Structure 1
Amino acid sequence: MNIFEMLRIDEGLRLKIYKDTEGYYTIGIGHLLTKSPSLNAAKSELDKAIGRNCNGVITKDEAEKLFNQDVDAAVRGILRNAKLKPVYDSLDAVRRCAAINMVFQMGETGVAGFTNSLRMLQQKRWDEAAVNLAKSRWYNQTPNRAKRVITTFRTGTWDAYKNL
């Protein structure tokens, strides 16, 4: 398992514009297009992102290119953030994937506010971190995905993903 496989499981792959769990226009492997309720605005964002007139549909290659960019952006967001970088650098490789997954889903500023969990992770208090992480809108709104990511932080293994 690696971060691409993990997020491909969590986000799926859809080649036509769809609405994500929050009702926002998205495409590909969880590439958010816009939070605007306008499908036309989403199509404009899509065309800008891909560099051609897509009329709301892309190829698998194009989806994977956006996904490479989005993973890259999540990692860079972590490395540029003074609250996230030290915790990330303290983690092992599997747990770094759980970190990237959260930043991919919620964005860097969002995650950077998880202050108590960040501290417990930096301290390697894994069961405590897991308990704290579940006390969140995130866990309540996407509990199956949150449980996988939390298990990944708790154990430092891919046990929650290997069956998938």
Structure 2
Amino acid sequence: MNIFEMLRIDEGLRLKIYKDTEGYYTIGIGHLLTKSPSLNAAKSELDKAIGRNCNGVITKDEAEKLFNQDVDAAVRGILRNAKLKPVYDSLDAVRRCAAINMVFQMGETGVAGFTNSLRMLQQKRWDEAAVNLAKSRWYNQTPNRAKRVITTFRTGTWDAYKNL
């Protein structure tokens, strides 16, 4: 298991524009195109992202390229964020994947809300962190994914993903 396999399980793979769990136009392996209600706006973003006229459809290779870029961007975002970097640097390799997973899903605008979770993770209080992380819109709206990510933080193992 690695971050690519983990996120591929959590995000799936679809080659045509679809709506994500929040109703937003998305493609590939959880590549958000726009939060605009306009499908035309989403198609413009897709064509810009891929560099050709896609008419709402991409290849698997194109999906995997966007995914590589998106994982890289999630990691760089963590490294650039004064609140996230010290916590990330304190984690082992498996838990670092859980961190990247959350940033990939939610971005960074809600980082302050996770202040207490971050402190518990830095303190290596894994069970307490797991309890705190579940007290969230994130957990309530995507509970199965959140449970997998939280189990990964709690245990530092891939147990929640193995079967998958």
Shift in Å, 1:109: 2.7
Moved over 6 A (4+): none
What is the TM-score of this pair, normalised by structure 1? 0.99
1:92 aligns with 2:92: yes
Shift in Å, 1:30: 0.1
Q: In 2, Cα distance between the equivalents of 1:96 and 1:133?
A: 15
C-alpha spacing 1:16/1:49, structure 2 compared with 1 (3 Å): same
**Identity fraction in percent:** 100
Ranges in structure 1 where 5+ consecutive residues have no aligned partner? none
C-alpha spacing 1:91/1:112, structure 2 compared with 1 (3 Å): farther
Ranges in structure 2 where 5+ consecutive residues have no aligned partner? none
* Counterpart for residue 107 of structure 2: 107
Q: In 2, Cα distance between the equivalents of 1:56 and 1:19?
A: 12
Shift in Å, 1:73: 0.2
Q: In 1, Cα distance between the equivalents of 2:102 and 2:157?
A: 16
Q: In 1, Cα distance between the equivalents of 2:90 and 2:112?
A: 15
**Count, aligned residues:** 164
Shift in Å, 1:3: 0.1
Secondary structure of 2:18's match? Answer: strand
Q: In 2, Cα distance between the equivalents of 1:13 and 1:143?
A: 20
C-alpha spacing 1:112/1:84, structure 2 compared with 1 (3 Å): farther
What RMSD in Å do the two structures reach over aligned CA positions? 0.6
Shift in Å, 1:112: 4.7
What is the TM-score of this pair, normalised by structure 2? 0.99
* Counterpart for residue 15 of structure 2: 15
Secondary structure of 1:108's match? Answer: coil
Secondary structure of 1:26's match? Answer: strand
For residues 68-110 of structure 1, give each alpha carbon's deviation from its aligned partner in whole angstroms, at most 9, with x where no partner exists: 0000000000000000000000000000000000000000232
Shift in Å, 1:150: 0.1
1:25 touches 1:32 (CA, 8 Å); kept in 2?
Answer: yes
